[PDB]
């Protein structure tokens, strides 16, 4: 019956090594509802929601040959909340890594993904409260217990990727999570701007043309 307030926090650029990391953090009384990342060239290893000093933080990983990455936290005032992270490691021999909120009453607010390999491989091409990532990547689900909290998924896909793809939440909903659907080649990153989910792409033409899809997690109370 309350209002859900969310804001975007960008970390400082990480630096150019494989071990160079970027951390985006929320204020002590805010909740980290999602974690995304951005790199001007691509050449990234995704991101993960990690526990640091009792609170959850958004950590971004750089790839070998990458100039650095930005960690992008979505920070929200969610009253009476209990948020946890559920991780599924990669299954390289599968059609994609899957994870969902295990506790009854748990609501999915965001999906993060990170990989250990230098870049993501090729393959032959969602459920309630479920995150789906690349077969070679670890998938991280942000799962929250909050009274009256309801979340829904909205998608927008364009064949010609260009500069960006956007998907916006409807009026009355708050954008809590922003990401790109997996298998979409040439993704620079994703980030929330108000109630709009922005997915940036490297504009590389088709080589079966594909569709770069912006995936939004929209939440409300009551």
């Amino acid at each position, epitope marked *: 019956g309350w209002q859900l307030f969310c804001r975007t*926090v960008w*970390s400082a650029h990480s630096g150019p090594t494989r071990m160079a990391t970027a951390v985006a953090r929320c204020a002590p009384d805010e909740e980290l509802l999602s974690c995304s990342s951005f790199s001007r060239s691509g050449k990234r290893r995704g991101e993960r929601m990690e526990a640091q000093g009792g609170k959850l933080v958004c950590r971004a990983h750089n790839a070998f040959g990458g100039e650095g990455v930005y960690a992008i936290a979505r920070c929200c005032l969610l009253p009476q909340a209990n948020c946890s992270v559920h991780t599924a490691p990669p299954a390289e021999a599968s059609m994609g890594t899957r994870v969902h909120c295990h506790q009854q009453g748990h609501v999915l607010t965001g999906c993060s993904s990170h990989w250990e390999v230098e870049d993501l491989g090729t393959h032959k091409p969602g459920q309630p409260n479920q995150c789906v990532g690349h077969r070679e990547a670890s998938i991280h689900a942000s799962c929250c217990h909050a009274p009256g909290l309801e979340c829904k998924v909205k998608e927008h896909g364009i064949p010609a990727p260009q500069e960006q793809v956007t998907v916006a939440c409807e009026e009355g909903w708050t954008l809590t999570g922003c990401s790109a659907l997996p298998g979409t080649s040439h993704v620079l990153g994703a980030y929330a701007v108000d109630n709009t989910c922005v997915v940036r792409s490297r504009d590389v033409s088709t080589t079966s043309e594909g569709a770069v899809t912006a995936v939004a997690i929209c939440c409300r109370s009551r």
Partner: nanobody, 127 residues
Framework: QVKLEESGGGLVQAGGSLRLSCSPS????????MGWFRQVPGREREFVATIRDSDASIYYTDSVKGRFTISRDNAKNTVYLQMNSLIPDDTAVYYCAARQYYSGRVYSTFREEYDYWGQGTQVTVSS
């Protein structure tokens, strides 16, 4: 009825320093909290810094910690944003924000938490 007036900004080179100032037209208006937000085009107005009445009330976004300093002068009724070792990523339109009344939160970090805003001052950090 209160309009916040911003001073400073413009072009400055990487590694350089700049001081932004902000004061209301009516100097008898004392805000409980003063803040700085910045907007990169295509992105939301993001939180930079906040201050109330003490050093314990000061809070910065991680990306500006150790480089930027927020201070308040009651006698001049002005809030300052001293920006040192400026990096190309500091390029944005910087906005002053004022929250008139008390907040139960230790730090006011959301746009929605503020009432009055500055016009916005462009900061461009060369090469």
């Amino acid at each position: 009825q209160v309009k916040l007036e911003e001073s400073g900004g413009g072009l400055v080179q990487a590694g350089g320093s700049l001081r932004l100032s902000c004061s209301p037209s009516d100097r008898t208006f004392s805000a409980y909290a003063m803040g700085w937000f910045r907007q990169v085009p295509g992105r939301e107005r993001e939180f930079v810094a906040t201050i109330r009445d003490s050093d314990a009330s000061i809070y910065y976004t991680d990306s500006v910690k150790g480089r930027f300093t927020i201070s308040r002068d009651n006698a001049k009724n002005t809030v300052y944003l001293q920006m040192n070792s400026l990096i190309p990523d500091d390029t944005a339109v910087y906005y002053c924000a004022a929250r008139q009344y008390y907040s139960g939160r230790v730090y006011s970090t959301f746009r929605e938490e503020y009432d009055y805003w500055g016009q916005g001052t462009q900061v461009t950090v060369s090469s």
